[PDB]
Amino acid sequence: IIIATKNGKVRGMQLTVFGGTVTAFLGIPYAQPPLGRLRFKKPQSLTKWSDIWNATKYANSCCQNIDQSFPGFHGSEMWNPNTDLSEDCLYLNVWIPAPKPKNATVLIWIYGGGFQTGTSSLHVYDGKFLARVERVIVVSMNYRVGALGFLALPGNPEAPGNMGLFDQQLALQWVQKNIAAFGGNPKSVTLFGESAGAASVSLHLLSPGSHSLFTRAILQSGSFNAPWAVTSLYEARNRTLNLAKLTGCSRENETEIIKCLRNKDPQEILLNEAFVVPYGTPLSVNFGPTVDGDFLTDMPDILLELGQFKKTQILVGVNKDEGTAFLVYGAPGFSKDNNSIITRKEFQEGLKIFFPGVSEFGKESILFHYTDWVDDQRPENYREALGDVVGDYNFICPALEFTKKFSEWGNNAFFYYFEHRSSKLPWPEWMGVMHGYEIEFVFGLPLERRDQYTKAEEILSRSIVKRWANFAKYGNPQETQNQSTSWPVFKSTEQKYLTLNTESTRIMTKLRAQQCRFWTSFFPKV
Ligand SMILES: *[C@@H]1O[C@H](CO[C@@H]2O[C@@H](C)[C@@H](O)[C@@H](O)[C@@H]2O)[C@@H](O[C@@H]2O[C@H](CO)[C@@H](O)[C@H](O)[C@H]2NC(C)=O)[C@H](O)[C@H]1NC(C)=O
Ligand SMILES: *[C@@H]1O[C@H](CO[C@@H]2O[C@@H](C)[C@@H](O)[C@@H](O)[C@@H]2O)[C@@H](O[C@@H]2O[C@H](CO)[C@@H](O)[C@H](O)[C@H]2NC(C)=O)[C@H](O)[C@H]1NC(C)=O
Ligand SMILES: *[C@@H]1O[C@H](CO[C@@H]2O[C@@H](C)[C@@H](O)[C@@H](O)[C@@H]2O)[C@@H](O[C@@H]2O[C@H](CO)[C@@H](O)[C@H](O)[C@H]2NC(C)=O)[C@H](O)[C@H]1NC(C)=O
Ligand SMILES: CCCCN(CCc1c[nH]c2cc(O)ccc12)CCC1CCCCCC1
Ligand SMILES: *[C@@H]1O[C@H](CO[C@@H]2O[C@@H](C)[C@@H](O)[C@@H](O)[C@@H]2O)[C@@H](O)[C@H](O)[C@H]1NC(C)=O
Ligand SMILES: *[C@@H]1O[C@H](CO[C@@H]2O[C@@H](C)[C@@H](O)[C@@H](O)[C@@H]2O)[C@@H](O)[C@H](O)[C@H]1NC(C)=O
Ligand SMILES: CC(=O)N[C@H]1[C@H]([C@H](O)[C@H](O)CO)O[C@@](O)(C(=O)O)C[C@@H]1O
Ligand SMILES: *[C@@H]1O[C@H](CO)[C@@H](O)[C@H](O)[C@H]1NC(C)=O
């Protein structure tokens, strides 16, 4: 029940899972609380304790704005924090199999939420099923988001940028120094994450300070080359100065600006985050990763292109309808409570919401590439086109381009296309296989027979859980026993990928080839 770590003793709790037992340590601190003079700085190392730390409940979630667009709707609210918000939020969780394993592979989860939201305590990130079923150890951590996690004045240690990424890194360090005491193998650590969590994972593959802290990496619906994932040196500064003006903290000594922002309540910083950009989108990452000269040494597109990253296996993938979820947070004519049949004029209006600073010619060129109908009378034509536009530009094409470029330097890569709509999904049917709704299958929630999922979904989750676990243990995401479809490596020539669904697993080639040539090779010139 009690494990001695390098900083002190922690006490866990016993969980009953599938007629078996998992030991959970919820809320182990891994850094000095970033409070007071520590706000905005890199995370500081934690001093020893002599008592027994009780890690039996999830800790505080990091300060963040909350989705209030659909009060009382489980579809949006399941992503809102489920513990108190506090700047005192640098804690992590460990699920170990019972009985204590001897040398278990470790899976470290990094949540998404656009670098502005998210928390490790969410129900769909419960690691107890992976521990029970595959005998891996699951670790997840809270990291700072929003301006408190990524405010940037490059070079200035009072606010150097990328603090949230350094939080994640200090947690990976904790796993290296401490996980053997829990039965884990620090030499067999697989990072996995979704959305901004996946972008984070892709940046740890790029940061030299993370290279000895993990073995392999899994990227679900995200990567650093997505247009939302990296704030520019220019933008970050305009945004830092705009936040200072909004809080009455405009000063000339840049350090006295930070000092002034350190006497503001967290609530005042959160209220003004939305407005630092003149035109935002539903996908807007107001404060995100930057080229800080510490975590990130050069612009990441250049490092990817020139082979400057950790050489290892990656598992990458995306969902069939990445884009649809964002259409009901601003696009005109849309609603989760009707079928959202939009006109051509509403389509064009929607491009202005999602591409606010793009030229007229650029928006016409999107319209031209996505409105060459196979049938011009289908009334859902424009509704589906805008979802595909948003998903292809923001997620699917950047992930495919990351996988091609990474694989060109000789490592095995595996690419999946998730296309199952959860039978319990509370969003309407027109949004399809939504952004974020593979996560519960990865974490094995359908394996609980009590949870109203179908048995076909139990089989799909069971197979995904095995493939993920085999990837982390052996570099190879196969299911070798139940006559499953073999997952081939993704090579830059043939570009084979595997489809994940309840009907038939299939091998296909060159996903969204025609679409991604537009986004990756033409649209960057506009
Ligand atoms: C626990 O296992 C490690 C080996 O981990 C494996 O090898 C990694 C390279 C990676 O592929 C993981 O996914 C694997 O599971 C043992 O490491 C050995 O330690 C001895 C120390 O005497 C060293 O001489 C060997 O070179 C190491 N082997 C490798 C392959 O690096 C470790 O000893 C095991 N510890 C316990 C307590 O079981
Ligand atoms: C860079 O910053 C300036 C300043 O932004 C303004 O102040 C902030 C506190 C915030 O409330 C913003 O929404 C404000 O607009 C931006 O300049 C503004 O641009 C808008 C339209 O682009 C214009 O209507 C305002 O009058 C401008 N205000 C000032 C003081 O210049 C600017 O657009 C930002 N971005 C770029 C790329 O320059
Ligand atoms: C689908 O609904 C949108 C959103 O309208 C709101 O939500 C509905 C479910 C309903 O309760 C409405 O009363 C709400 O206002 C509709 O878009 C609106 O259309 C009106 C024209 O009647 C327009 O003035 C508003 O600006 C629109 N609102 C937005 C956010 O675009 C849309 O017409 C509905 N489409 C279908 C096919 O039913
Ligand atoms: C201005 C409105 C922002 C609302 N947002 C929430 C915060 C956010 C901003 N930008 C992002 C980018 C991402 O990849 C993921 C989340 C976010 C989208 C909410 C969705 C969560 C993810 C799964 C779909 C269901 C609703
Ligand atoms: C830490 O926890 C200690 C033991 O917890 C108690 O015993 C177990 C079996 C559970 O039933 C649990 O709910 C009980 O509370 C406490 O004795 C100790 O006071 C705790 N320390 C602090 C600082 O709260
Ligand atoms: C594999 O299947 C198990 C149950 O299926 C039975 O066993 C296999 C080996 C075949 O003989 C089949 O005809 C039987 O019905 C599941 O319990 C197990 O979880 C499955 N494993 C994975 C990774 O999906
Ligand atoms: C506010 C509102 O009218 N909600 C309606 C919901 C949602 O619109 C969808 O589940 C998508 O969110 O759909 C129902 O058909 C349903 O699922 O039983 C009935 C209900 O009236
Ligand atoms: C800004 O203030 C800090 C703290 O008082 C001081 O160390 C620094 O030298 C000042 N810089 C300038 C340019 O005034």
Coordinates of N, CA, C and O in Angstrom, one line a residue, residues 35 99 127 144 175 177 187 197 212 214 236 254 259 264-265 312 347 350 376 390-391 403 434 504 512-513 520:
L35 N 3.4 29.1 -7.5 CA 2.6 30.2 -6.9 C 3.5 31.4 -6.5 O 4.7 31.2 -6.2
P99 N -1.0 -8.3 -8.7 CA 0.1 -7.9 -7.8 C 1.2 -7.1 -8.5 O 1.3 -7.1 -9.8
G127 N -6.8 5.4 -16.1 CA -5.8 4.3 -16.5 C -6.0 3.0 -15.9 O -5.2 2.1 -16.2
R144 N 0.5 23.1 -16.8 CA -0.1 24.4 -16.9 C -0.6 24.7 -18.3 O 0.1 24.4 -19.3
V175 N 9.1 9.9 -13.5 CA 9.0 8.5 -13.9 C 10.3 7.9 -14.0 O 10.5 6.7 -13.6
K177 N 13.2 8.6 -12.4 CA 13.8 8.5 -11.1 C 13.0 7.6 -10.1 O 13.6 7.0 -9.2
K187 N 13.2 2.1 -18.7 CA 13.7 1.9 -20.1 C 12.6 1.6 -21.1 O 13.0 1.3 -22.3
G197 N -2.2 17.3 -26.6 CA -1.4 16.3 -26.0 C -0.5 15.6 -27.0 O 0.7 15.3 -26.7
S212 N 16.2 11.2 -23.5 CA 16.5 10.1 -22.6 C 15.4 9.8 -21.6 O 15.6 8.9 -20.8
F214 N 12.1 8.8 -22.6 CA 11.0 7.9 -23.1 C 11.6 7.1 -24.3 O 12.6 7.5 -24.9
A236 N 3.4 35.8 -30.2 CA 3.5 35.6 -28.8 C 3.8 37.0 -28.1 O 3.2 37.3 -27.1
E254 N 10.4 45.2 -19.2 CA 9.6 44.0 -19.5 C 9.5 43.1 -18.2 O 8.5 42.3 -18.1
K259 N 6.1 41.2 -13.2 CA 5.9 41.5 -11.8 C 4.4 42.0 -11.6 O 3.7 41.5 -10.7
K264 N -2.0 39.9 -10.2 CA -3.3 39.8 -10.6 C -3.9 38.4 -10.1 O -3.1 37.4 -10.1
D265 N -5.1 38.4 -9.8 CA -5.8 37.1 -9.5 C -5.8 36.2 -10.7 O -5.9 36.7 -11.9
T312 N 13.1 6.6 -33.3 CA 12.3 5.6 -32.6 C 11.1 5.4 -33.4 O 10.9 6.0 -34.5
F347 N -21.7 28.6 -46.1 CA -20.4 28.0 -46.3 C -19.3 29.1 -46.3 O -18.4 29.1 -45.6
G350 N -18.7 30.7 -43.2 CA -18.0 29.8 -42.3 C -16.5 29.9 -42.5 O -15.7 29.8 -41.6
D376 N -24.3 17.8 -57.1 CA -24.6 19.1 -56.7 C -26.0 19.4 -56.1 O -26.3 20.5 -55.8
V390 N -12.2 22.0 -42.2 CA -11.7 22.3 -40.9 C -10.9 21.1 -40.4 O -9.8 21.3 -39.8
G391 N -11.3 19.9 -40.6 CA -10.6 18.7 -40.1 C -9.3 18.4 -41.0 O -8.3 18.0 -40.4
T403 N 3.9 12.1 -40.4 CA 4.3 10.7 -40.5 C 5.2 10.5 -41.7 O 6.2 9.8 -41.6
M434 N -16.2 11.9 -34.2 CA -15.8 13.2 -33.8 C -14.4 13.2 -33.3 O -13.9 12.2 -32.7
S504 N -15.0 -4.3 -40.7 CA -13.8 -5.0 -41.2 C -12.7 -4.1 -41.1 O -12.7 -2.9 -41.7
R512 N -6.7 10.8 -47.9 CA -7.0 12.2 -48.3 C -5.9 12.8 -49.2 O -5.5 13.9 -49.1
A513 N -5.4 12.0 -50.2 CA -4.3 12.4 -51.0 C -4.6 13.7 -51.7 O -3.8 14.7 -51.7
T520 N -1.1 21.1 -48.0 CA 0.3 21.1 -47.6 C 1.2 21.7 -48.7 O 2.3 22.2 -48.3

